[PDB]
Amino acid sequence: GVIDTSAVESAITDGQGDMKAIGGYIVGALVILAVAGLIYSMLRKA
Amino acid sequence: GVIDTSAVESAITDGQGDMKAIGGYIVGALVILAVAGLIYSMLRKA
Amino acid sequence: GVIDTSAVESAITDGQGDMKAIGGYIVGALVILAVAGLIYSMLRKA
Amino acid sequence: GVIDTSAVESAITDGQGDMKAIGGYIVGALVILAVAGLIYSMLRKA
Amino acid sequence: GVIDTSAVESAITDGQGDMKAIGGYIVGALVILAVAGLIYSMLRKA
Amino acid sequence: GVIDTSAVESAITDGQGDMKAIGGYIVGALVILAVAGLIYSMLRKA
Amino acid sequence: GVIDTSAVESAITDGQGDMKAIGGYIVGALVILAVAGLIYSMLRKA
Amino acid sequence: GVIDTSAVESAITDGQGDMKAIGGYIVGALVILAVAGLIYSMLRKA
Amino acid sequence: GVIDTSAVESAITDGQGDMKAIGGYIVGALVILAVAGLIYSMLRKA
Amino acid sequence: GVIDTSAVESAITDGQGDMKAIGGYIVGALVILAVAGLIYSMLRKA
Amino acid sequence: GVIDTSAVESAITDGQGDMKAIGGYIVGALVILAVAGLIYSMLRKA
Amino acid sequence: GVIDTSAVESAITDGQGDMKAIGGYIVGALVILAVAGLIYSMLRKA
Amino acid sequence: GVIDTSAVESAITDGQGDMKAIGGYIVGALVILAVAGLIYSMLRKA
Amino acid sequence: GVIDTSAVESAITDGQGDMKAIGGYIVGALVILAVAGLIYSMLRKA
Amino acid sequence: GVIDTSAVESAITDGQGDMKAIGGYIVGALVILAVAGLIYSMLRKA
Amino acid sequence: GVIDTSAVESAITDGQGDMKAIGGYIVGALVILAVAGLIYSMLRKA
Amino acid sequence: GVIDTSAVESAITDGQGDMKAIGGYIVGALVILAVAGLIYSMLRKA
Amino acid sequence: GVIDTSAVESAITDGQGDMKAIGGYIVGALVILAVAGLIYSMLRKA
Amino acid sequence: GVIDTSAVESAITDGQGDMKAIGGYIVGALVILAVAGLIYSMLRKA
Amino acid sequence: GVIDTSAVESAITDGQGDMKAIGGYIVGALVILAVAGLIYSMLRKA
Amino acid sequence: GVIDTSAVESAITDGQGDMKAIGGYIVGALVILAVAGLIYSMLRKA
Amino acid sequence: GVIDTSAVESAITDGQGDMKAIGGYIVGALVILAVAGLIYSMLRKA
Amino acid sequence: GVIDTSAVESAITDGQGDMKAIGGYIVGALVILAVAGLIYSMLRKA
Amino acid sequence: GVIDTSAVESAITDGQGDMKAIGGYIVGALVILAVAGLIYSMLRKA
Amino acid sequence: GVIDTSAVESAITDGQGDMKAIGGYIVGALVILAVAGLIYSMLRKA
Amino acid sequence: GVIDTSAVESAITDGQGDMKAIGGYIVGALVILAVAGLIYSMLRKA
Amino acid sequence: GVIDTSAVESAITDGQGDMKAIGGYIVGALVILAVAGLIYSMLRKA
Amino acid sequence: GVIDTSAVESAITDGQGDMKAIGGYIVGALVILAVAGLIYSMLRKA
Amino acid sequence: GVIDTSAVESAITDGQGDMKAIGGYIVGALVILAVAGLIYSMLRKA
Amino acid sequence: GVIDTSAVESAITDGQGDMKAIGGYIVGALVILAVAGLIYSMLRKA
Amino acid sequence: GVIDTSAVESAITDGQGDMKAIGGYIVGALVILAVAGLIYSMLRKA
Amino acid sequence: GVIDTSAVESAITDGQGDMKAIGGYIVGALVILAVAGLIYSMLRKA
Amino acid sequence: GVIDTSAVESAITDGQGDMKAIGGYIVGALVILAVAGLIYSMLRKA
Amino acid sequence: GVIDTSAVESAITDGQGDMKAIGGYIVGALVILAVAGLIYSMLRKA
Amino acid sequence: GVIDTSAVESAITDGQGDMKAIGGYIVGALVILAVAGLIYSMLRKA
Cβ-based burial of W44 (10 A; exposed 0-12, middle 13-18, buried ≥19) = middle
- Interface partners of chain AH (CB pairs < 8 Å, 3 or more) are X, AA, AB, AI
Q: Is Y19 on the interface with AA (CB under 8 A)?
A: no
Q: Could you tell me which of D36, AA41, E36 has the C-alpha nearest to residue C12?
A: D36
Breaks (C-N over 2.5 A) in chain P follow: none
Q: Is X23 on the interface with AA (CB under 8 A)?
A: yes
CA distance linking residue S4 with residue Y13, whole number of Å: 39
CB G7 to CB I15 under 8 A? no
SS3 O40: helix
- Interface partners of chain AC (CB pairs < 8 Å, 3 or more) are W, X, AB, AD, AE
Size of interface AE-AF (CB pairs under 8 A): 49
CA distance linking residue AH26 with residue AA32, whole number of Å: 13
How many angstroms away from the CA of G5 is the closest CA of chain C? 6
Contact S2, R20 (CB under 8 A): yes
The method recorded for this entry reads: NMR
CA atoms within 13 A on the CB side of M22: 32
Breaks (C-N over 2.5 A) in chain M follow: none
How many angstroms away from the CA of AI42 is the closest CA of chain AH? 6
Domains and CATH numbers, chain D: 1-46 (1.20.5.230)
Compare CB distances from AI36 to A2, A8, A26 and report the shortest one's residue.
Answer: A26
DSSP string, M1-46: -----HHHHHHHHHHHHHHHHHHHHHHHHHHHHHHHHHHHHHHHH-
DSSP string, AI14-44: HHHHHHHHHHHHHHHHHHHHHHHHHHHHHHH
Q: Is P39 on the interface with O (CB under 8 A)?
A: yes
CA distance linking residue T33 with residue X39, whole number of Å: 43
Which CA distances in Å does AI40 have to O4, AH44, AI2?
A: 88, 21, 63
Cβ-based burial of AA45 (10 A; exposed 0-12, middle 13-18, buried ≥19) = exposed
To test the contact with chain N by mutation, choose from J13, J25, J38, J45 the residue with the greatest count of N C-beta atoms within 10 A, namely J25
Q: Is R39 on the interface with Y (CB under 8 A)?
A: yes
In the 3-class helix/strand/coil scheme, how is Y20-43 assigned residue by residue? HHHHHHHHHHHHHHHHHHHHHHHH
CA distance linking residue T25 with residue T23, whole number of Å: 6
Compare CB distances from B24 to A1, A4, A11 and report the shortest one's residue.
Answer: A4
CA distance linking residue P1 with residue S36, whole number of Å: 134
To test the contact with chain C by mutation, choose from B5, B6, B8 the residue with the greatest count of C C-beta atoms within 10 A, namely B8
Which CA distances in Å does E4 have to D14, D22, K19?
A: 10, 11, 20
Q: Could you tell me which of Y25, AH26, B43 has the C-alpha nearest to residue AB41?
A: AH26
Q: Could you tell me which of AD37, M29, AA16, M23 has the C-alpha nearest to residue U25?
A: AA16
Contact L44, M32 (CB under 8 A): no
CA distance linking residue AA38 with residue Y29, whole number of Å: 7
Q: At S14, phi and psi to the nearest 5? A: -60, -45
Contact I5, H22 (CB under 8 A): no
Which CA distances in Å does K7 have to K3, K14, Z19, AC32?
A: 11, 11, 105, 64
SS3 S3: coil
How many angstroms away from the CA of AI42 is the closest CA of chain AF? 28
CA dihedral AH17, AH22, AH24, AH29 (to 10 degrees): 170
- Interface partners of chain Q (CB pairs < 8 Å, 3 or more) are M, O, P, R, S, V
Exposure letters AA22-31 (e unless 16+ CB within 10 A, then b): bbebbbebbe
Instruction: Report which secondary-structure segment, H or E, holds AB25.
Output: helix AB6-45
R33 contacts on W by Cβ (under 8 Å)? 38, 41-42, 45
How many angstroms away from the CA of AF37 is the closest CA of chain AI? 9
I30: Cβ–Cβ under 8 A, 6 or more apart, which residues? G40, G43, G44, J38
Breaks (C-N over 2.5 A) in chain AG follow: none
Which CA distances in Å does W42 have to R29, U20, X21, AD34?
A: 10, 9, 18, 45
CA distance linking residue AI39 with residue A19, whole number of Å: 14
SS3 AG46: coil
DSSP string, chain J: -----HHHHHHHHHHHHHHHHHHHHHHHHHHHHHHHHHHHHHHHH-
Compare CB distances from AF45 to AB26, AB29, AB37 and report the shortest one's residue.
Answer: AB37
Handedness of CA C36, C42, C43, C45 (dihedral sign): positive
AG16 contacts on B by Cβ (under 8 Å)? 28-29, 32
Q: Could you tell me which of K29, P28, K39 has the C-alpha nearest to residue L18?
A: K29
CA distance linking residue J36 with residue I29, whole number of Å: 12
Q: Could you tell me which of AE37, X14, AE11 has the C-alpha nearest to residue AC36?
A: X14
Q: Is X32 on the interface with U (CB under 8 A)?
A: no
CB C1 to CB F18 under 8 A? no
CA distance linking residue H27 with residue U31, whole number of Å: 49
Size of interface G-AG (CB pairs under 8 A): 41
CA distance linking residue G36 with residue G31, whole number of Å: 8
